[model samples]
Target chain A: GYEVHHQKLVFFAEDVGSNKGAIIGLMVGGVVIA
Target chain B: GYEVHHQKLVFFAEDVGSNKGAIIGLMVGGVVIA
Candidate 1:
């Protein structure tokens, strides 16, 4: 039997008050290579 | 000259919709997964 796993690609962002859309910070990851 | 005091940097602003600093936050240098 062979098997493969599942991973995902995604990101998270943050905003503060009216400046929330400024993308002050972000993070993205979780990619699978096969 | 604005000397850097903390190892990290942060900024702040007052709330909107006619509110005070009812909500504010700190920065990150320690503490993960919270």
Candidate 2:
């Protein structure tokens, strides 16, 4: 059996005080399967 | 007011029948605020 770990983050334009715009810098972590 | 429409997909290593491996192709669509 193996183990898969995942994580995610979500952001909105309005929350950041924007009409409709933002930048997404996705940083995926390492996975461990055992 | 702005509308934030986001979508995501998750996958596991075992589900894909792998010790611990897979390719991730992230496609971020356009955002619309009204």
Candidate 3:
């Protein structure tokens, strides 16, 4: 048996609203990584 | 006159679309930084 590790890739974009928060993108370990 | 420096703070959230990009929040030099 072997242990597997996963990486989390977080992406961001411009803030649309007046709030201090914005949109984010998430990419996990897969065939095509972002 | 003196030159001022500004820092760019980028924030990210969950990806709402199917694209490889995501939302991002920016906070430059201001009174209250996020």
DockQ of each: 0.03, 0.03, 0.07
For candidate 1, write residues A1-34 as lDDT tens digits: 4443343322322334443222223223322111
Q: Estimate the TM-score for candidate 2.
A: 0.18
Give the higher-lDDT candidate: 1 or 3: 3
Give candidate 2's fnat, 2 decimals.
0.00
Winner by DockQ: 3
User: Which residue pairs clash in candidate 3?
Assistant: A13-B23, A13-B24, A23-B23, A24-B13, A24-B14, A24-B15, A24-B23
Isolated chain A: TM-score per model? 0.20, 0.19, 0.20
Ranking by TM-score: 3, 2, 1
Scored by lDDT, the top model is 3
**Per candidate, chain B TM-score?**
0.17, 0.20, 0.20
Error of 3 at A8 (Å): 24
Evaluated at residue B30, the lDDT of candidate 3 is: 26
Better of 1 and 2 by TM-score: 2
DockQ of 2: 0.03
User: Across residues B1-34, which tens digit of lDDT does each residue of candidate 3 receive?
Assistant: 4343443433454334433332323333322212
Error of 2 at B32 (Å): 7.3
Q: List the residue pairs that clash in candidate 2.
A: none
| Candidate 2 CAPRI-style tier | incorrect
Task: lDDT for model 3, please.
Answer: 0.34
Error of 3 at B19 (Å): 12
